[PDB]
């Protein structure tokens, strides 16, 4: 089997992407944030504290003839950005882009933190990291991809995120028309439960490539590109007037600037992030200070290849017995 679903930016900055997912019988379609940095499929629901729901579409398990309470199971997750959610668990039928899993754990939120309530466009998350990170207790549950894997034509999914435009998540096949050149594959460590890999270096604009190992994770659920402070300083030094602002929380730059590109290495291959992808717009409405899309990972504890980096590539998440990651230009 295969599946193919369009993923759409939630706003004009590409802050996140939502993908429609069918849950239950008859189908209840919710728009979920596909997240290669976590391993829980959770949804706003009829059980979510009413004051914490503000415009999201909710899953109502009592209206699904295939929903079953997973007796005794609870979940609670805290994400790297300080957000959180928790609740109980149903199993139900879940379909993405024509690919159907029966008996998928659907984690129903009883509580969500403020940033989730404030994002009316995101009805929940669909985790695509390794199932070892799933938070369901006392019986850990499998991700949608892990449940689908055995049935897929090939044990892979691909992320093709758009810049200021829709893109695609495919399951079970590699669309050879969706990228240019060849796909370069690179080793993955699953020891922390993430799609963790080592970039071979970077370049700023038209500058020379610096060969240096940069360990990090491919995280579709993170908006920006978080890299070591040395690398980030080298980038912003090429933008007149750019500076790190403690009050704003990162590097800012004059909105009148033209940003240089940023290249990262994948083996001997190179992925180029155009300068425009690094512009996240005014820090507040009407400001002439703009927020940068490349930020320091110091204090996060890990480097993160988030959407800014991933949307410059066609990315293969190869879930074979020994997982690997593939990157192609597009």
From Swiss-Prot:
Molecular functions per Gene Ontology: aspartic-type endopeptidase activity
EC top class, as a word: hydrolase
Catalytic residues as annotated in Swiss-Prot or TrEMBL: 35, 199
GO BP term, example: proteolysis
Cysteine pairs bridged by disulfides in the record: 255-290
Residue ranges of every copy of the Peptidase A1 domain listed in the record: 17-328
Catalysed transformations (reactions): Hydrolysis of proteins with specificity similar to that of pepsin A, prefers hydrophobic residues at P1 and P1', but does not cleave 14-Ala-|-Leu-15 in the B chain of insulin or Z-Glu-Tyr. Clots milk
Entry annotated with the keyword Signal: yes
Keyword DNA repair: no
EC number from the UniProt entry: 3.4.23.22
Keywords: Aspartyl protease, Disulfide bond, Hydrolase, Protease, Signal, Zymogen
Family to which this protein belongs: Belongs to the peptidase A1 family.
Protein's name in the database: Endothiapepsin
Organism, as annotated: Cryphonectria parasitica
Lineage per the UniProt record: Eukaryota, Fungi, Dikarya, Ascomycota, Pezizomycotina
């Amino acid at each position: 089997s295969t599946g193919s679903a369009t993923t759409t930016p939630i706003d004009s900055l590409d802050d996140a992407y939502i993908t429609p997912v069918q849950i239950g019988t008859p189908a209840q379609t919710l728009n979920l944030d596909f997240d290669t940095g976590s391993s829980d499929l959770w949804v706003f629901s009829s059980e979510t504290t009413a004051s914490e729901v503000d415009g999201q579409t909710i899953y109502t398990p009592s209206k699904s003839t295939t929903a079953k309470l997973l007796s005794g199971a609870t979940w609670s997750i805290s994400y790297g950005d300080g957000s959180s959610s928790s609740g109980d668990v149903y199993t139900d039928t879940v379909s993405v882009g024509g690919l159907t899993v029966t008996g998928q754990a659907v984690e129903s939120a009883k509580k969500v933190s403020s940033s989730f309530t404030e994002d009316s466009t995101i009805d929940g998350l669909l985790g695509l990291a390794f199932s070892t990170l799933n938070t369901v207790s006392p019986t850990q549950q499998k991700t949608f991809f892990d449940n689908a894997k055995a049935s897929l034509d090939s044990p892979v999914f691909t992320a093709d995120l758009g810049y200021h435009a829709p893109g695609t998540y495919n399951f079970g096949f590699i669309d050879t028309t969706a990228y240019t050149g060849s796909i370069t594959y690179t080793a993955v460590s699953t020891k922390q439960g993430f799609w963790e890999w080592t970039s071979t270096g970077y370049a700023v604009g038209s500058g020379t490539f610096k060969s240096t190992s940069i360990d990090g994770i491919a995280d579709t659920g993170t908006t920006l590109l978080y890299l070591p402070a040395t690398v980030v300083s080298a980038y912003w030094a090429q933008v007149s007037g750019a500076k790190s602002s403690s009050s704003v929380g990162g590097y800012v730059f004059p909105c009148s600037a033209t940003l240089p590109s940023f290249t990262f290495g994948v083996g001997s291959a190179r992925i180029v992030i155009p300068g425009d992808y690094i512009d996240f717009g005014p820090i507040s409405t009407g400001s002439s200070s703009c927020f940068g899309g490349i930020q320091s990972s110091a204090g996060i504890g890990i480097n993160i290849f988030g959407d800014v980096a991933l949307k410059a590539a066609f990315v293969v998440f190869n879930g074979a017995t020994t997982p690997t990651l593939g990157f192609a230009s597009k």
